[model samples]
Target: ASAYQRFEPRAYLRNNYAPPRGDLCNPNGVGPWKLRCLAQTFATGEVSGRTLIDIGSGPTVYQLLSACSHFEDITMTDFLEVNRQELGRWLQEEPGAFNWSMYSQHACLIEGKGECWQDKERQLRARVKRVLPIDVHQPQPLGAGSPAPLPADALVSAFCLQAVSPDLASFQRALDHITTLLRPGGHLLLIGALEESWYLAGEARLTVVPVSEEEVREALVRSGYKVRDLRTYIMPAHLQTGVDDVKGVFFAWAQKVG
Candidate 1:
């Protein structure tokens, strides 16, 4: 855990300095592509009307925002108080940011609104019914448990899990917690860095335990998930100082089986 703690300064820096990239908070430009891929797979057909739960969601609110039309309800969870506050601000300003036509066009393509995932003729305001305060690594109180409200049809975790668990055991426990939150036959989408030790969050520094695709897949399988798809993405290092020791981020998807 102490080794993981070393990256805390970097996390603090990212929280402050790192702005959400893309229309969402991908930060690494891989989020939209990953979302499109997930839509083509799990969000298609009978799963169209199901709900999505985004764990460790940051201030950007992109995962829930982008998937709103597809799911009747969307939930965003994060441990930080400030992250939740920022999400509230985004909710208030969303409607005004886009005209009805533009919003509908994008929503329709994502299978978010209307019958049969088709475009609805009317303008729809995206709603986030619940914003939960969750720590992915810890068990929540029964009243506010991880699977509260209802078991999710699909779960998406981006840049959350790797930061929360300090060791392999803790990471496995966290994945088990996530598995418990999803319904049988549900899907999981994960995105995070590989071999990344620290990052800037504003001016503060955050420590991250380095994790690889293999470890993530193994953890998912051990926790009762059937890993269906896995992918990796790399972006040029933002820092000019540490160019020699950087590697790209990783993204993966897994499914829960009955």
Candidate 2:
């Protein structure tokens, strides 16, 4: 079976995105920091297009809150069926869909646009066209028969590559594979755990290949991306909730050069 076979979406959400870690009141927390990072990046207006593809959505929509305003069509993908189901619940406004209001609110707050969180969520829901399955290890990320429009204008992946990859080589290969899904000169907003060996998602303890900022930059270059911006967030001592040994997080904005 797959390594993510045992992943529990609800528990995973509770473990990392609840309480201390996901507390919106604490602006310095990891969850808030991630939203801020993405919002700020989108504010630059450097990344925009008709279609945007989310490489590994993992039952979360916060990564695309700000992106919704920048792109007309959005395609979300994940390797796990449960993850896709979770996303569908939210997209279709299913009851008990994991409440993402806090995340959307935080993103709007960062944007300073006087926008309502509810409106933001609606916008994202409308913009997301599909929640498809994807395996970045394959050259064709969306699979051979997927109907998702290819060579997307932009790609956004959050905490996916290192978290799923068993080794650094596979991570590099996965990066190169996903790069093919993006058009030439397209942008990629990548987020990943830095120096994280393992993380707990419910009963499953997923293994992650530790990566450094330098390694990430080198990998992007090797994958034909020109690194436009790279930033790292050092995990504050208090934010370490023991869900994982992640020492830091990295957010990289890169563009496909060739």
Candidate 3:
């Protein structure tokens, strides 16, 4: 209840006001760093072309930016209009917010914290050529009433879902929406907070709805996605500032199947 409503304005504003900080909000920062470390893991001997669709993509387009080198095309979607607008502005600017220098700094931070591996930090930076706007909850302009853009090879969502869905049903619906955007043997990468306390539009303190690892795995299975890899990383509480009292978030990786 509080999680879904809390992100209304803050999500968009943060996307616009603080793109760099937005990247820091990811709970599974280590997971992505690992992906960057072992880029060869996902690589097939073939051409390795793919199209990525990111759901609930906030302003920074971090994952989309990261996947540019490996993927053929990328489309980002969000339920909030402000996010789209903010992303649009960043897209149009000369110094696009998603740049290699920025990614390098992020990689260094992750590496410093021992979350990153192999020191393959530069691999994370790639030029994104496309940024299409789509609303994950609604249909996209395909030919008729398509709820999303055509399915892609991969779908990624970070620090989203839980913030906007009021209940498990809504969360299920959101998962279903993303599922429709993935091809039969595609991948789904997700990251969200378990019990995050943050300020929202009206400076309201909101607590994210608790969605356990079991619930997530079950939901993905029901949605026809196989949980290939599921990992949870704990961000220890900071006793000095009293900020570490809450539960850490979860990072998930699932694959779509028939």
Candidate 4:
């Protein structure tokens, strides 16, 4: 069985998003940094369209907190049914879903639009039209019969390709595969771990293909994207909690070449 099949959503959340690392109030923290990056990028008004998709959303909502305001038609996808179910719980406002109030609040804070967190959360829930399964390895990441609107206007992926791929070549292939789901001239906002070999999620010690900033840019270019902006964040000493040897993180905004 695949290591991902054994992934525990709650344990994974606790490890990455709990206390020390998950503190949303700290602007320097990874969580806040990612949100700020995405929020600021979207605020540029360069990535708006009719449909936006969150590729490989694993039981987390912060990635889309800022995006909900930009696109009304949002689709979230994951490889595992458990992850999909977890997202469903939050989308359905189930009794035991993970609390993401602070995350929404942080997003609102960064946007600095004087928006309430509750309204932000409700907006995301309403905007996310579907939570579907995706396999980035497949030529058609959303499957041949996906109900999602094809050639989406924009695609956002956070730490998904390298985490799922066994090697650098496969990671590049996966990026190319997902590119098919995006339309020409559409934007791709990608976030990924830099120099990370593996990470533990629940009981599963999933392997990750360590990638460099240069490698990420090259991969995107080879995959038919024109790199518009690429930024890196060095993982601070205190934030490195031994879950993985992640040296840093990279955020890239690329436009698919028409």
Candidate 5:
């Protein structure tokens, strides 16, 4: 029953507030360093691109920091209104909002760009024009619109599928559902925890359907994508949060096929 439970935004905010340990700002200091690597990957490949849709973006900004310059337009989605509200408050520069400058700085360093970190943050805020709701279980990922928007040219998802799925099957189903939103030959940048079954959010614990690198590859192929690259970051013992046994993090880029 606990494994299938949904996320709690309040608990998420409470747990991830400490700097360099619990927050998004500690890219250089943290282990599994998937977000930092993802940003670098985005910067190195295809300098500029079109639309990008970030799926299940929790209270994190590092995933899209590098993407801002490359993608002309960007959209982010979350299943909970609370998560979207958190993102909006930060974008609006509201009081008590989480600080994300270091993530921008980390991304800037990786990008080798001379631009100021504020501008990096500004660019990300500007490019993210939409923060809509998404339920990967539905045929329409975004709730019905007057007219459907074009399919996404690229998708970035990190710690998302297993976070929401009760089992690997659900993860697979949701994976396929979202990949459909990408046009043929479009890209999907994926990040996930390896061999992790659960994690703590404040006092609450959330499930992460444990997966192997092999399973991830199989899932991509099954969903009609060709894996372009796959990289892993082993989590050192000091980095292990007694909360989750996340052995490592996996990053992969895939292209949709006809």
Candidate 6:
């Protein structure tokens, strides 16, 4: 077995990320909280000259779904080829691809447009131009043969840095590494977990480098990001699924200091 397969829950991981369920779309729930938080960020003002790239996309569109209407150029990237393939499957409308309309509906509600979720989904799919693979540990996350769009106008990521890093310091380096792809003065929409270690992906266990809200700020500050907005979603008692012991999640809008 391959290293990742050895540590990965192959079968379960295949179906791990389903379309957003009703519970996940709640306004006060973690899912809605993420979409809602970004809604407010873009409301701060209109953005220009910035292609929106989602780092560590993980075959999920929730993070980029809302940004679709905001930015014309949208690119997604993941660390593993499998993830990129999964994203491509959905982008190509493959039969077994994951459905994302349920989450898109929540995004529509957050935007107050009340547009049909199907419209939004189609828009998102049309907006996404490419789904590529990356290595956050490398200074150039995409390594070689990457596009000129490396330093994006706005970059968004969720549950990426800590989930892939084995140690706190490693997470710090990964953040710094990925930040190289963010244009100076560009905005970064970062979301992540707090105080949690080890989450089940399939049968494969992935280690998480637990971090506090304070630590999150420090990392961004040290990485030359001037934090503009921050939000946290505290985990509820009943939401525990044993998939991961995630204490909670946070969203931060940070701008690279020019």
Candidate number achieving the greatest TM-score relative to the actual structure = 4
> Each candidate's lDDT (Cα)?
0.59, 0.91, 0.55, 0.92, 0.76, 0.78
In candidate 6 the C-alpha lDDT for residue 179 amounts to 88
Ranking of candidates on lDDT, top first: 4, 2, 6, 5, 1, 3
Kindly list the per-residue Cα lDDT of model 2 for residues 19-107, writing each as its tens digit. 87878888778888888889888899998889999988998988999999999999999999999999999999998799889998889
lDDT of 5: 0.76
lDDT for model 2 comes to 0.91
What's the distance in Å from true for residue 128, model 2?
A: 0.5
How high is each candidate's TM-score?
Answer: 0.72, 0.98, 0.68, 0.98, 0.89, 0.91
Candidate 5, residue 21: the lDDT equals: 51
Name the lDDT of candidate 3: 0.55
Tens-place lDDT per residue, model 3, 66-116, is 355566556666655655666665555435333333454454454344434
**Residues 1-258 of candidate 1: C-alpha lDDT, one tens digit per residue:** 333323332344243223332233343454445455545555555344467788877664434434565677777777766666656655555432212232234334565544432234221125466677876665541136344456888888877777666667877787788777788988787777677666555433456677778988888889888878787766544332331232655667787878
- Candidates 1 and 5 compared by lDDT, better number: 5
Better of 2 and 4 by lDDT: 4
> What is the descending TM-score order?
4, 2, 6, 5, 1, 3
**Per-residue lDDT for 65-145 in model 4, tens only?**
998899989999999999999999999999899998988988999999999999999999999999999999888888878
Query: Candidate 6: misplaced stretches above 4 Å?
Result: 1-3, 6-22, 46-48
Instruction: Give the better candidate number (2 or 6) by lDDT.
Output: 2
**lDDT at residue 68 of model 4 (Cα atoms):** 89
Best-fitting candidate, measured by lDDT? Answer: 4
Model 2, residue 203: distance off in Å is 1.4
* Candidate 1, residue 163: how far the Cα is off, in Å: 1.7
Where in model 3 is the C-alpha error above 4 Å? Answer: 1-48, 94-100, 104-133, 139-149, 196-207, 239-246
Cα displacement (Å) at residue 158, model 1:
0.7
